[PDB]
Amino acid sequence: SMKIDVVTIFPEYLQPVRQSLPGKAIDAGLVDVAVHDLRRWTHDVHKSVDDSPYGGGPGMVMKPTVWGDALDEICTSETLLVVPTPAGYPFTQETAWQWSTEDHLVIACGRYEGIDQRVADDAATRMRVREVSIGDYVLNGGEAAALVIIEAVLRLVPGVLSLLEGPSYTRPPSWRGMDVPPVLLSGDHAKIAAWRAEQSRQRTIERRPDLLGFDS
Template sequence: MRLDYLSIFPDYLAPLGLSLPGKAAARGLIDVRVHDLRDWAHDKHRTVDDTPYGGGAGMVMKPEVFGEALDDLRIDGATVVVPTPAGRPFSQPLARELATRERLVFLCGRYEGIDQRVLDHVATRAELVEVSLGDYVLNGGEVAALAITEAVVRLLPGFMSNADSLVTESHEAGLLESPVYTKPASWRGHDVPPVLLSGDHARIEAWRHSEAERRTTQRRPDLLAPVTLDVPGEAGGADDTARLRLAVPGDAPELLTLQLACWVTEALVNDDLGIPALHEGLDDVRRDLDLWRVWVLRTAQDRLVASVRARLGDDGSTWEIGRLMVSPDLRGSGLGRGLLAHAERSAPLGARTFLLFTGKHSTANLRRYKRAGYSVREVLDGPSGPVVLTKRRRD
């Protein structure tokens, strides 16, 4: 790939000769050429800017110098990248797209920007891509050009010595990357999560996926593909579409309220006030957010109406599903079936068996789970059992 840069501060782009980009250039994988835009200015001051038409603050980069430079660089057929706050947001998909091009030409603007006619002219000769790093303003395009270059060239075949490292990075699988650790196992009172020291690859993979989902939910929920379920409207009103997402600590109080409402019914049906869910408090619910993957279903009016949780068992092959809860006023609406299906789909690859519990006198639950393909494995001792049900994974 050939990379050209037009800038009035060419030394700003010296880092292109360092680290992996520098090594890639030395191996001939990329051809880096940095050009001083002032070389195409013909007055003694090498002027590249002038006052804006219509008045206003600042200066605008002149079209003449860019025009001559673009002619000499023969940009026809290339992809011209212009970093600008007015561009489309830069993203990993865009980086992958740019990595397929044979030549990128970066126009690094300064001051109030480049005369629009330059961009209009470029668009008649080459592919024009205006890109913004984010919702903020830099002094010039050089920093953005460096960032875009690094994101693009590392995707070129042969650039990374270990191509597998690209697969699990943030934004590659639609999630942020999970936390990473190295030796020592304990440092300044902070310990590596025990699962990473277990040698159990199935549990480690499940932990990493769970942490990636949790981190994405907390920091970048906009990256998650929404899962929606239809909720019947109240009092004959229009149906509502509720979104399913991983729970965050702020959901804990409503989760506790839903849990108590649901398990009071279970206690009455099974004549058992000893059901653990009835005796848990807010701290228990918050703790379980770290021990389980917990999903909550919220309506467009931000009402938490249902939840389910799951985790990989100690054997590394059993996907334990629990606390399947639907608000009492919405029972029979199909939400429980949808939540159960989602929990099953979320199982890691190493999970081969689904497992869940219900009360031995909870006939409606038993009927629902049997319809979903679950079979009774055993009934434990106690007023409410519970009944242990399992199902073999089919995929």
Template sequence: MTGFPKLVRSPLEDSIIRRAQMKGLVKIDVYDLRQYTFDKHHQIDDYPYGGGPGMVLKPEPIFRCVRDIQKRFRLEKPRTVLLTPDGQTYDQRKAEELSRERHLILISGHYKGVDERVRQALVTDEISIGDYVLSGGELPALVIIDSVVRLVPGVLSDYDSAATDSFSTGLLDHPHYTRPEEYEGMRVPDVLLSGHHAEIARWRREQALERTRERRPDLYERFMKEKALEKEK
């Protein structure tokens, strides 16, 4: 759901997302908020009450659009996500949670934000993709779509690829190598050439732990705490 549909349509027509739609595994509709306005200028924003800089997305087009979707798909209370910089930081766990939903509505914020009544009456989740500000919620919406679609069974030819991505296990991913065995003096670790699956799995686990500890100590600490709790059980 956006006031700028051209920003999102092209990425939805390529790569994995396109193939998922062609297979009938997912269906993605782009709703133009301007189609839910009744004034001749198709205005979707207005000045904020109380003054101040910037414009605010009006509630009427968003309410009309959500209700149209509810009626069209016979949804009573659909999972409705607002993309906003003051939302919960998005992560792989959230992606996995959203991938289990049958229907999902994404509202792309824009300008200074949306009228608060949209939050109060329609939104079930508020999501941010990081502590920085973008021009609108269209790019964050595409991030969510991509991360959710690839988790839908059948989308990836090798589902294990998604199941072992960074964050899926609570850790960053281990290093990857492909041919040739040596390039500009840099060799593939011998263990990966050994054919010893248990040793390879051990090496990858150790590398993932070390990489997470160095690069994302916050994730490492959470992972170790969760493992300690599992042992206590």
């Protein structure tokens, strides 16, 4: 039984969480996902969440005051606070497995050029905080990364249930003049196992040589 809170200035973007696996997990009561509009914790009439950076630079930085009030209300000392950021530690399969046993995840979605560093620093005095990157590309905000993290974690939760997988096939055995590899039709478990292992090897060498300790 897991609780996930997501905090964002675009709560509408997190609605895909209601589809597929995450939606099913919600419907089965294995997780509760709540999405919160950060602007709820603002007090000015313009509901400002960002300001220009100290020391200069392009863009805006999200204000610590608003985030601090939001996290005060949402988090407890048991919370794992997840902050997606291109400058984060890598989020990997190992991370997904680790977080799959947490009682409470809170995901802070940043926009503009990021969140004032003191938000994470202050939070870390009261709870565990993890700044993570889902990959080596830049997004406009943390919302898509939140969806990725939720999907990668939820499919591992006990309630629901290296090298690259090789090609897979299904019916019909011949299509547009392309045949399923005969060994897959042969019913020989030993030979199928070996062919699949080999396929996995070739694909990994080709597409992800780093997984086998080779130069990219």
